Design a protein around this ligand. Structure first.
Ligand code: A1IWY
Ligand code: ZN
Length: 258
């Protein structure tokens, strides 16, 4: 009886094993576009992914994770609200059963079909496991997906999903360029929050891009053919792996743009 997204183990249950679920800086949140304040002191965001080294893709039973070599400064996030250098370690998505839900953040209560999280850790803490113990340990770049035109830079991900259908399966995933998943604009909202899965640690600087990327219906359909279960277990489609919006409490969402 471990955590997940079902009726019996989903987000309303997590607080029993992870009491920080009801904490002061939980994620995701609703982004109220009329309450977020433009902050002219926010520096521009620096996404430096030209030397990114992807290694592997893994079905972890919750989502699929594309992992990078983070043993040197090869793909880094800097600037915006961040002090110092954050190294890309992995990305993953959250998505829905239907096009009208799937994102974790919402924008004026609007739910997108999916959300991409590009996870980075603060290199002043030396490794990812130390960085998650610090209030400024992580920076997650959140990008919304809407269903429309295909995203060409997503298709290499979609085409490998058949090879990692079940929990615990991995596949070699070299030479993938995460620059193909970005929208044109790097305009963003930022706030202090948490991991959106157990252990729900309050270690994240959230940077959520305003502009969604477009993916095709056929692209998201292939996400929804994944399984939460292991090989040889009863099939449970990997859908609706999103945590809903948490109370904003004593926090301010800042906008990089007027
Ligand atoms: C979609 O589901 C995901 C996605 C990511 C991960 N994470 C890791 O597996 C890691 C690592 Si690694 C050294 C085995 C490559 C991150 C994670 O679990 N962080 C906690 C932790 C604590 C100590 C040591 C290691 C990890 C984590 C990171 C970001 C988020 S999110 N959704 O962006 O807020 C959540 C969890 C977990 C799940 Cl269940
Ligand atoms: Zn996530």
């Amino acid at each position: 009886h471990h955590w997940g997204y079902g009726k019996h183990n989903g987000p309303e249950h997590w607080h029993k094993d992870f009491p920080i679920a009801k904490g002061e800086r939980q994620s995701p949140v609703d982004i109220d576009t009329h309450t977020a304040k433009y902050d002219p002191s926010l520096k521009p965001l620096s996404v430096s992914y030209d030397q990114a080294t992807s290694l592997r893709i893994l079905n972890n039973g919750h989502a699929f994770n594309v992992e990078f070599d983070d043993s040197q400064d090869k793909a880094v996030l800097k600037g915006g609200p961040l002090d110092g250098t954050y190294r890309l370690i992995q990305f993953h998505f959250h998505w829905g059963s239907l096009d009208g839900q799937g994102s974790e953040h919402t924008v004026d209560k609007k739910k997108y079909a999916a959300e991409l999280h590009l996870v980075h850790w603060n290199t002043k803490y030396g490794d990812f496991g130390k960085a998650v113990q610090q209030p400024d340990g992580l920076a997650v770049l959140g990008i919304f997906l809407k269903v429309g035109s295909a995203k060409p830079g997503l298709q290499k991900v979609v085409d490998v999903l058949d090879s990692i259908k079940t929990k615990g399966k991995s596949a070699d995933f070299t030479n993938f360029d995460p620059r193909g998943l970005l929208p044109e604009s790097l305009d963003y909202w930022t706030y202090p929050g948490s991991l959106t899965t157990p252990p729900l640690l309050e270690c994240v600087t959230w940077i959520v891009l305003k502009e969604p990327i477009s993916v095709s219906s056929e692209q998201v359909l292939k996400f929804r053919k994944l399984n939460f279960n292991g090989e040889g277990e009863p099939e449970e489609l990997m859908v609706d792996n999103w945590r809903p919006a948490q109370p904003l409490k004593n926090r301010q969402i800042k906008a990089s743009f007027k």
